Design a protein around this nucleic acid. Structure first.
Lengths: 53, 57
DNA sequence: TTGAATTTTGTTCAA
DNA sequence: TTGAACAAAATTCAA
């Protein structure tokens, strides 16, 4: 749940505020590989939803 | 729009393969017989037009 | 988790 | 507008 709020924070920064993973790494004081892994986790828990026509 | 309709269709097919089928941009290029850079551009075109929609929470 | 290695993506250039 | 080439962004691996 600490993990959860963080994946959400990473996701908003990435998809709503157009940040790169590195920008998000610095802004949250964590590694780029951790950003990658959270971004996958956000999509897994459906915090990030992708729908196609 | 008939050249546009071609682009829309090609765009939507690229997006499905990418986001539903988990294909690499390279794989999509093979299947649709187009350059990988063209795929990169089509995927962006699909997001711009709302063919793909990404929502957080 | 992260530092290193590897693979995938986006962009510039010339056409 | 498209594909070639390459720098760099993202992902995977090993620890």
């Amino acid at each position: 749940s600490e993990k959860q709020q963080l994946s959400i924070e990473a996701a908003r920064l990435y998809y709503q505020s157009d940040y790169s993973q590195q920008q998000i790494a610095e802004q949250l004081n964590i590694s780029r590989p951790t950003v990658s892994r959270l971004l996958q986790y956000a999509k897994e828990k459906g915090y990030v939803q992708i729908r196609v026509m």
